[PDB]
């Protein structure tokens, strides 16, 4: 509880200089992010598609670039955000695949977020060590939504924070 709508937290906080102390720390937080919050959540595909289109379209971020195949990479990202890819078609996340992966999640304060990311995928002189897949992010406010696309973008790779 306690709604405060100061998004991403990052709200000023006080420790005060009020006694053996002349100053102290006033701080705003940072360090308060999304990837964690949302839990995986699920859907019927036809309805899904319909829905996918239907949803708050308004955010997307791109996937392109990493350190891994989207097998290990995808798993890693998935676990990191604690979120769902709804369903496979065996077409094949292996030989290429030339697979677009649909992901859904529902959070602790209940937003459902929808993705279709469509991605190249690693494999010798076939394709995938980048993507150039587009991550399409729908979350109700664009501001969190895009931000989520980012957040995930942060999540995507593994490097010096």
């Amino acid at each position: 509880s306690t709604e405060n709508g100061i998004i991403f937290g990052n709200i000023v906080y006080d420790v005060s200089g009020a006694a053996s102390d002349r100053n102290c720390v006033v701080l705003s937080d940072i360090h308060i992010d999304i990837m964690d919050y949302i839990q995986p959540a699920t859907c019927t595909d036809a309805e899904f598609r319909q829905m996918w289109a239907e949803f708050e379209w308004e955010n997307k971020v791109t996937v392109n670039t990493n350190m891994t195949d989207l097998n290990d990479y995808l798993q890693h990202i998935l676990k990191s955000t604690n979120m769902k890819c709804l369903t496979p078609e065996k077409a094949l996340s292996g030989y290429c695949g030339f697979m677009a992966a649909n992901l859904y999640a529902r959070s602790i304060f209940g937003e459902d977020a929808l993705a279709n990311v469509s991605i190249e995928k690693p494999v010798h002189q076939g394709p995938d060590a980048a993507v150039t897949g587009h991550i399409r992010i729908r979350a109700k406010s664009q501001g969190m939504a895009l931000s989520l696309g980012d957040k995930i973008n942060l999540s995507q790779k593994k490097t010096s924070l």
């Binding site: 000023v12 002349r22 006033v26 705003s28």
Partner: protein, 281 residues
Amino acid sequence: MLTKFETKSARVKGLSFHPKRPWILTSLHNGVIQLWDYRMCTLIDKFDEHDGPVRGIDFHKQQPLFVSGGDDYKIKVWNYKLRRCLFTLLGHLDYIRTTFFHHEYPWILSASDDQTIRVWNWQSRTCVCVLTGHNHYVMCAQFHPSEDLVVSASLDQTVRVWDISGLRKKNLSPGAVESDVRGITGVDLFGTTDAVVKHVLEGHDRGVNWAAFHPTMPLIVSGADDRQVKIWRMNESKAWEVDTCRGHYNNVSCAVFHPRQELILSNSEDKSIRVWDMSKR
């Protein structure tokens, strides 16, 4: 390098920057007093001190507190931090421009925009000082070099410099040679705001918007109710010191010294801030 935050609003007569904090406390004549402890781009509080206008802002001198003045005519000191009112007296027939805090017996000075300013004992109850020598409507009231020596700027077209006492105003002296306040080539006029020859300096320049002091010094840097903002040094007292500070188009509401910077910053009304030296000027 960066102008971190910027929205044009507020119609601002009185102003102060936190010598300790990156606060700006701002007085509008919207009737508003505001403290924003400017750092986190956030206002702590905002009280429109009364229905009438607000001209004054001054420091208590401590760390984070305001002493405030409105057309209420009241000296309030309220601590933002402690969100409470320290000791209270209202004001005469005009608002409070400057304040200083002292403490033999935790003791107090209040500087005012009207008539008198009175300095009060709430401990071993006696009189430290009485200041008469103001009339109405003080634009910029000031502590001097000696902090508890002072200057005031008026819409009564005078300037007052006063001498105080621990039992009201007086000074004892007998050694000097000539004076720069008044004693050789050039010098600017007395005004009338009080009635003792300390120096009441002429605040006529259609009236004086601001007065600013030179710490050990008596040079003043001024805002004036003339295009002419006229600069005088009473640590010299030049001729072509009958300087009118000139825009292109009208005014020079103020022009000011920056403690550190040996410079003058001018600001005016053709849509402008005008840039001035004062190191070689």
